[PDB]
RNA sequence: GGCUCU
RNA sequence: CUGCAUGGCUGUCGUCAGCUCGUGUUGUGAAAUGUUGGGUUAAGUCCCGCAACGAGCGCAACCCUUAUCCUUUGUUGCCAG
RNA sequence: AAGGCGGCCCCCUGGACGAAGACUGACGCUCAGGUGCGAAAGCGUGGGGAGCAAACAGGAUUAGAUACCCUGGUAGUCCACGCCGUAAACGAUGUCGACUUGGAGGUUGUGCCCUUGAGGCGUGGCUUCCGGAGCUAACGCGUUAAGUCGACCGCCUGGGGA
RNA sequence: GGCGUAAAGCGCACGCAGGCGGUUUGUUAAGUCAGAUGUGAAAUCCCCGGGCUCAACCUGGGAACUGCAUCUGAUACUGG
């Protein structure tokens, strides 16, 4: 019960919001429900797709969803086949005309949500958690990260006594505000319970 | 290469008092004058000449030599001798693990080089000038400690030491690594960790200069050979 | 190549303000199938790191042992701190008759026929030190011949 | 100044 | 229902200045050194010294606001002339 | 010898050490049982009795206070002769002998050098501290060994119960 | 195998019996060593073999029974 969320603390400095629109109070919470429902839908559909960051922006009563994903071939299919299928249901949910853009994720090993979900998928298919944490750290420091910290929590190996473990390689300054800390969190629903995964990635300092 | 009355003129026969001496120096002590032991130069000369012969052996095959003295009296003399025979020196404090943890000290050799590159040659002007002074006293410290070996790159092949107890740490690190040791063993020291024992005074500047000049000679002659 | 055996792992502790800190120790021994033997003792928060540190220290600090064909040369004794250790050369194919840690150190030592006995404390660290000291100070007929200044045949 | 137990 | 099967979130000691690692070395070993010493600081802050050399999380700064000034832009704000 | 021994003087008396010589010629070491000595407290008889002080009494303190604190105070402490025969009676290290690097002292002899000053060089006895090898579980001991060996004795064998 | 601190040096000492005993020469030959002889029942154990279809088992021969006694020598050590 101690640490602030590094994204929410970095949101004015080096991190951008995942929703960049403007509205008055009349249509604010309605837009925010619509954004929640579409991020819900896209996560369930693109679960096998290595989606990282769903960015939502709505100008002129027209939603524009920018999906960042490690592979766009399975999300698109043919050019506007599955994307157009998801676009017409996004416009059904949002009630406005939609537009879907796709940003490819270079170096998917340097994206916190993908790493945590890969670990979660491994724990769900019953691998050793320490091997998963090692390979995530070795792969990120190989790919060029200045520092990674992972942390799992609870019911490890089906052990009735829940504990947390964490690995660290490189420097991860959380208190440094200009640090490009990619932080995200996943959950593994094992047969013995819920295993929580947190991941911090330090890319370097933005000199604004 | 140095005669006995040369050693006697420089002051090699002097030593320390009789309440500080090591009983292992009995085969090296001639007598005791004014409550001070006297070093047998009869056994000093042929042992120093055996050491210079082995120095000529290693510098024949281009071995690396490290001069070790941080007595704050022979610091400049051990520097001028190692830059005379372009070998490597330690004039200020022997860092603990300079040899055994070489792979760690190497990362400070590299840091000293990049700081010298950036500031003198690299002209790494225009930073926060207070950090430029923290860089300055950093580079001063690294040159003061690791400047004599910054071009060595690997482990040396022989170590020449001025005092076996003021520098007993370098003896142990060399003794572990199988590196031969040539040392000026005074009366208050231990001649066991030294592979080639040279009796003689340690604080006498004339004797330090005699030893170092005789080594920089038989090294340059062994280098050329 | 160099065969490597861990003898024993052990979990140790260290009590601090927060509570108990656990750690793991590893005792490994290496050898070339001949007289070159060496042991290591590593310690870390985790068991594979401890075996790796132990194998690292064991690959260095090797010691050379003047073996006979496949056995020792004379009945030798070794002590370290709790562990008087007796070992004896034996006939061909009688095996390694030895207890615990001494079996592992002699197996990587390349010995194959001993009659050993560990008296006293059988702590594996001290008994493996006592075996290393016994094999190290075991001397050959050549070394005793050069020492006494006689031939081997004059020694028999 | 002394000032028990858990 | 079980917070004594769990995640997540929060309190707390405590914004206290501390907690550790790698290699090296010492010790049979648990462990130690580093991290100790002299000063100094809000601070394991800095300097010097030293079997340690280095590094990391933290102590700091980078953030916001206030406090003075300048330029730009002057309405729905302003009024010296 | 240990326990232990503290003004000064005398009487009786034991032991140690040193220097040179002279003499005897293995006469020696250890020791079960045995014998003797053996702090304080205690006992007995006879004295003595200032101070201190178990006990005890009173005052306080405290929840209580058969205690610590206070005011008093008896055996006792003292002497002679006997008994007891124990102590963390400890160096918690049996006695005797031999060998093995050093340093700084203390004390007590003694030889020599011109004591050219209270100095200089030695050689014996006893003693303290540090410490090397080596030993030891470690702590530490370390030429006065807990090192390397020999001779003899005493003793130990899980914690209680005991 | 131990006894500074883990159990364990009598509180100290003298000292009988007892255990041990410097060095040299001579003698003895007790101890000791070597050899021989007698004995140490057989079985058993062990070795080399043989026989029951093998083995268990049975069995031939041998070694062994580390001992004791006598005699003959040896004389370094110990003793006298
Ligand atoms: Mg907080
Ligand atoms: Mg035991
Ligand atoms: Mg209590
Ligand atoms: Mg009660
Ligand atoms: Mg809880
Ligand atoms: Mg919880
Ligand atoms: Mg329960
Ligand atoms: Mg370390
Ligand atoms: Mg070690
Ligand atoms: Mg600390
Ligand atoms: Mg520490
Ligand atoms: Mg400090
Ligand atoms: Mg800091
Ligand atoms: Mg801060
Ligand atoms: Mg006579
Ligand atoms: Mg006696
Ligand atoms: Mg008696
Ligand atoms: Mg009395
Ligand atoms: Mg009386
Ligand atoms: Mg009376
Ligand atoms: Mg009275
Ligand atoms: Mg009273
Ligand atoms: Mg008693
Ligand atoms: Mg006493
Ligand atoms: Mg005492
Ligand atoms: Mg006693
Ligand atoms: Mg000492
Ligand atoms: Mg011993
Ligand atoms: Mg002794
Ligand atoms: Mg002892
Ligand atoms: Mg025992
Ligand atoms: Mg006790
Ligand atoms: Mg005891
Ligand atoms: Mg006693
Ligand atoms: Mg005799
Ligand atoms: Mg006879
Ligand atoms: Mg006979
Ligand atoms: Mg028979
Ligand atoms: Mg047959
Ligand atoms: Mg005789
Ligand atoms: Mg005789």
Q: Percent of residues of chain A in helical segments?
A: 25-40%
Number of helices of chain C: 5
Q: Based on Cα principal axes, name the global outline of chain A.
A: globular
* Termini separation of chain A: 31 Å
* SSE topology string of chain A: HHEEHHEHHEEEE
- Largest sheet, spatial ordering of strands of chain A: 5-4-7-6
Outline the fold blueprint:
This is part of a larger assembly, with chains A (208 residues), B (225 residues) and C (156 residues).
Chain A: H1 6-10, H2 28-45, E1 51-57, E2 64-69, H3 73-76, H4 82-94, E3 100-104, H5 112-124, H6 129-143, E4 147-153, E5 164-170, E6 179-190, E7 193-205
Parallel strand pairs in A: 2-3
Antiparallel strand pairs in A: 1-2, 4-5, 4-7, 6-7
Chain B: H1 4-10, E1 29-33, E2 36-39, H2 41-58, E3 65-68, H3 75-84, E4 88-90, H4 102-121, H5 129-146, E5 158-161, H6 168-177, E6 181-185, E7 196-199, H7 205-224
Parallel strand pairs in B: 3-4, 3-5, 5-6, 6-7
Antiparallel strand pairs in B: 1-2
Helix pairs in contact in B: 2-7, 3-7, 4-5
Chain C: E1 3-15, E2 20-31, E3 37-44, H1 47-59, E4 76-78, E5 85-89, E6 96-97, H2 101-108, E7 114-118, H3 124-136, H4 141-148, H5 152-155
Parallel strand pairs in C: 6-7
Antiparallel strand pairs in C: 1-2, 2-3, 4-5, 5-7
Chain A binds four RNA strands through strand 4, strand 6 and strand 7.
PDB class: ribosome
Keywords: cotranslational folding, CspA27-2, ribosome
Entry title: CspA-27 cotranslational folding intermediate 2
Which features does this protein show?
part of a larger assembly; 3 chains; A: 208 residues; alpha+beta; four-stranded antiparallel beta sheet; three-stranded mixed beta sheet; 27% strand; globular; B: 225 residues; alpha/beta; 2 domains; five-stranded parallel beta sheet; two-stranded antiparallel ribbon; elongated; binds magnesium ion; RNA-binding
